[PDB]
Design a protein around this ligand. Structure first.
Ligand SMILES: Nc1ncnc2c1ncn2[C@H]1C[C@H](O)[C@@H](COP(=O)(O)O)O1
Ligand SMILES: Nc1ncnc2c1ncn2[C@H]1C[C@H](O)[C@@H](COP(=O)(O)O)O1
Lengths: 521, 521, 52, 52, 52, 52, 52, 52
């Protein structure tokens, strides 16, 4: 509309109803000029770390992380009272846009409004550009609504052929100025709507039964098994007798079963105590990338983390593996620390009922056919893929964790649940791209066909609001005794948690899963 | 609408009619940035003074004090002609908003308009945030319409557990950016309406009878009482005789009565003459907080001031207590003075008809059952709570005093009249919150996920208008002789009162109650 | 319910202490009484209480 | 808390008697009536609308 | 109970001669008499409690 | 405060162990318990205060 | 029963009633080996908070 | 229930189920009970063996 009229309002709220919750979040953003208005091809040839791609002058909005849309109290209402969750629908607004001229004259910077400058915005609803929003990376909104965030720069990667970065003829370049975009001055605003495709609810419960205990403890099976090949307690001794017996109540390892535990790929285990670890360097011929379970694409080594869903150690246990996601608190400085106390460990231990341990094995298997002259031999199953009859449980969603991922576009996929957690989506929420339109500087008065390299220095600010409709399943259970709940157990604190401190800093000192309530198999 | 169009007009008026008066007040406000756009948790552990809470970047409007809405002549019309008062309805406008960029370059500050900046406003009509407006504190509009005032900063307190400030798990944090808010540029304006819940009229009259004199002076009672247990004028002497007599006209202390005076909690009495006071230090083991009547919550000592309604000394008397509210004139400098002449003392003496004195007692009580060998003993009743049959009178409203208070949200309360005076309201007039929206400064051209700490320096100005509909009861009385009125008795003055002085300063040199007219019990 | 103790007297003259009708120590002084504005008022009958 | 219901950042416009004497000790010093405004940070001395 | 007793402190009690109303009290009004008053006028004041 | 202090009289304070209700008090009722009573019958009497 | 649902703008998490009992030989709120059902805790109703 | 490790001791995730907590039909000698059920669609079992 006009310069003196606001194009939007601040809406941050959560509306609860039975079966539904609607969250809305508004933030203030600042967008700089990226790459000095240029596309730049980027890459380095570094063994397994070899990459190539392009960085763009554009930037984009990602709300993909849960604490963007929920307060700690709203997250508590959700996970204590509900078995399930899934987004129905979304809409995004960008408004109250302000473009700033910045000038340096005497060595100090002054800022003024440039009222006729535009910002460009388009949402890619057709997914024609590489989708980077699901990669588990920084640039999402801050969890605290008063914080102002910088819009992250957009870039993508190509095909890496071997361990060299050099492109081949299959590599694609994407110019974003090649997409129709809405141009906005200070009176203009942007809006888009989105509908989530139907997806299974996340399970916000933990099992109150074990996969192998599903039977009736009071009853025998009508099935029979071989109890022993000899009399006595000792191997390779006694008289040889085939002793068959009914499977009685009380020996539950020998019960026949309809179902098996899920798939496993063993993971290397590490101790939070420095003295209990073998000494493995960070880089070298023998490095920690070598010893972690890893996959190989096209010669390159990729850490398998978190990997297929598996039970893992508790968050307070000494041991941990790459199956656990790790978050940091404020205390570390410099992107490195020697203390695990500064870090937020995640535990999948809840799924120990239906899932094999990450650091142990799926089971043990008979290698050979024994006979009178051949002793039985067993081997470990460290990695076992899926066989008919397995049932498993997906990784939990976290308050600091990703909401969704984009299912890769390929002609096959299996159980498309994202391994870092959340909702696999063939058509995820679109990426909304934004850049500052270049404003040339004072030109030369003689025509030159060279492109304009000289530009006014600018940046823009504004507000962005995101609304999501969530569908929730209310817990209904006949359990008599009380459930586990998520509570404040923190006790007496100098500075209370989940609030700003003396200096005005807002930190998240815990990692909160969704699984508290229980449900029987 | 637009930058060159005013979004409101100046309305300051009072419209009088029989049964109704409507006041309207317009002021100019200035809003700075508070806490440098941050929430800050605040507290100190100081014995009884221990507190904790948060200060917010937000600020709020409070008109809660009477002289905001009335001129001294309008207050005179009200209290001379009317027995009663109470607000019907309210509406508030905020308009003509101006956001200013301030820049420092050579060591001097320049100010410019920032036309695209917004200010955020919301009224909390649902009372979900702690209500601080009733606390009897500074930040209300100035009484003189030409004065420009600063908008007060908002903050609240938590639960204090013991004498230590450390929070427990019951403490709540409130983010105001979590409430939907209207965003306003210079063309935009804000408006809200409010209806007062029905509340008893304030009594603008003083009683022309005494609670104990309500009888007919010409007549005897038909009741009888014990006059004496002995002959003669002396105690423990004479002949023992039970002497019964009718209660005759002329001895009115012995009349039987239907009603009792109100409740009392004795208060310590101080003299305005320094030589007539015992020497009590301000702080120490023995301090003045120790000697004043006080209450104890959770170990902490709170001054009981003003306390339950009680008659007190005249405003010109030598003695005073904490039952009296004290206001200051301009003369003191530095928030301290040794002279009572600089202070405006308030007197409840008008209620001496139905209320016990603040510094004396409720009465005296018999301790024991006397007999022939036991002499009668009496003790003072310093504090007596309410018994069936008491009738009392509330504290008076003052021209400098608070209009309303919020009744605490609790499952019991008794006679919810605010002890500092005014109208107890379950749903009081809402708090209207305002802050300047942050405008980031020139950012870095490389993405960082840290929050933006760098901001343009700004402030905003504008006008706020408040309209209140008041319902008034006109005095109707058959009193023959003239009433006491509120008049200008000041005489010949170098600088007349209730007007600006030579230097342009507007001060209030008197404290004006509402009780002049009289009414019989 | 609420209580304000009241002084007790005997209908038997010999069982009462000797209290004069008027004086410095009078019966108005010994009866439970209230004070408005300095004046003493007999609290009679007073708040409801069981009696003899 | 009932006694903390106020705004911690603001002073009252009310005034009270701070002390009857100079110094830290009882029954000592010079006799002076010292009045002061009720400042932020001393919350025991705030005037209040409600009682426990 | 006047005090908090302990191993070295004996418990002490005092009489409650006058006690006002607390939440949870229930009482009974004075009886009407054939020679007694029928009604009274409730005083005109901005508070009264149990106007019997 | 028990007494009115003066230049020759030191201030004296006493404890309030029992204090009934005065105008302006606000309180909070006892909590209900999972093992506790749901209701009670208000006694049939011609007065009661805060019948919780 | 009629219930009021909590609606509050409190940002940080509430205190909740949870099973904190830990690892138990015989779990609480269930029958024991001998078939006896006991209540080993007393549970109030006040967990959530509200401002004055 | 859930078995945690090789020890039987329950944790806070274990559930107890009282069946007297479900509405049930009570039957004397003249009464009878009936219920109907529909199978969800499921693939046929293969009652054949492969000839290739
Ligand atoms: N996150 C996610 N996205 C998409 N598809 C998924 C996901 N997780 C599982 N699946 C697939 C595989 C499951 O067997 C099936 C469940 O469908 P239903 O009948 O709805 O339970 O859907
Ligand atoms: N200030 C204030 N706010 C709310 N309630 C109050 C107040 N003062 C007294 N009351 C209550 C207690 C009184 O007995 C009653 C009078 O109601 P009526 O019939 O209207 O005279 O209302």
């Amino acid at each position: 509309d006009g310069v003196g009229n606001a194009s939007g309002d601040w809406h941050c709220d959560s509306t609860w109803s039975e079966g539904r919750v609607t969250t809305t979040s508004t933030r203030t953003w600042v967008l700089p000029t990226y790459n000095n208005h240029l596309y730049l091809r980027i890459g380095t040839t570094a063994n397994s770390n070899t990459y190539n791609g392009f960085s763009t002058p554009w930037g984009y909005f990602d709300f993909n992380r849960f604490h963007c849309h929920f307060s700690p109290r709203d997250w508590q209402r959700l996970i204590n009272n509900n078995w399930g969750l899934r987004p129905k629908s979304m809409r995004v607004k960008i408004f109250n846009i302000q473009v700033k001229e910045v000038t340096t004259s005497n060595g100090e910077t002054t800022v003024a409004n440039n009222l006729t400058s535009t910002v460009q915005i388009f949402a890619d609803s057709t997914y024609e550009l590489p989708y980077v929003m699901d990669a588990g990376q920084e640039g999402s909104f801050p969890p605290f609504p008063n914080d102002v965030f910088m819009v992250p720069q957009y870039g993508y990667c190509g095909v890496v052929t071997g361990k060299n970065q050099n492109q081949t003829d299959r590599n694609a370049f994407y110019c974003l100025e090649y997409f129709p975009s809405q141009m906005l001055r200070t009176g203009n605003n942007f809006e888009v709507s989105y509908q989530f495709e139907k997806v299974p609810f996340h399970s916000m419960y933990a099992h109150s039964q074990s996969l192998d205990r599903m039977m009736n403890p009071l009853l025998d099976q009508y099935l029979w098994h071989l109890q022993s090949t000899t009399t006595g307690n000792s191997l390779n001794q006694g008289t040889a007798t085939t002793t068959y017996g009914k499977i009685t109540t009380g020996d539950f390892a020998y019960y026949r079963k309809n179902w098996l535990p899920g798939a496993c790929i063993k993971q290397q285990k590490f101790s939070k105590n420095a003295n209990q670890n073998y000494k493995i360097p960070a880089s070298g011929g023998d490095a920690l990338l070598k010893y972690d379970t890893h996959t190989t694409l096209n010669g390159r080594w990729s850490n398998m983390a978190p990997g297929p869903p598996m039970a893992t150690a508790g968050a307070g246990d000494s041991d941990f593996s790459n199956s656990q996601l790790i978050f940091a608190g404020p205390n570390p400085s410099g992107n490195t620390t020697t203390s695990s106390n500064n870090l937020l460990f995640t535990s999948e231990e809840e799924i120990a009922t239906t899932n094999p341990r990450d650091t142990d094995m799926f089971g043990q298997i008979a290698d050979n056919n024994q006979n009178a002259t051949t002793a039985p031999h067993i081997a470990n199953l460290d990695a076992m893929g899926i066989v008919p009859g397995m049932v498993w449980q997906n990784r939990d969603i976290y308050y600091q964790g990703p909401i969704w991922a984009k299912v890769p576009h390929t002609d096959g996929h299996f159980h498309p649940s994202p391994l870092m957690g959340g909702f696999g989506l063939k058509h995820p929420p679109p990426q909304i791209f934004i850049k500052n339109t270049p404003v040339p500087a004072n030109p030369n008065t003689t025509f030159s066909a060279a492109r304009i390299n000289s530009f006014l220095t600018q940046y823009s600010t504004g507000q962005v609001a995101v609304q999501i409709d969530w569908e929730i399943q209310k817990e209904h259970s006949k359990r008599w005794n009380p459930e586990v709940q998520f509570t404040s157990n923190y006790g007496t604190q100098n500075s209370m948690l989940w609030a700003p401190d003396n200096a005005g800093n807002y930190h998240e000192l815990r990692a909160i899963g969704s699984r508290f309530l229980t449900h029987h198999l």
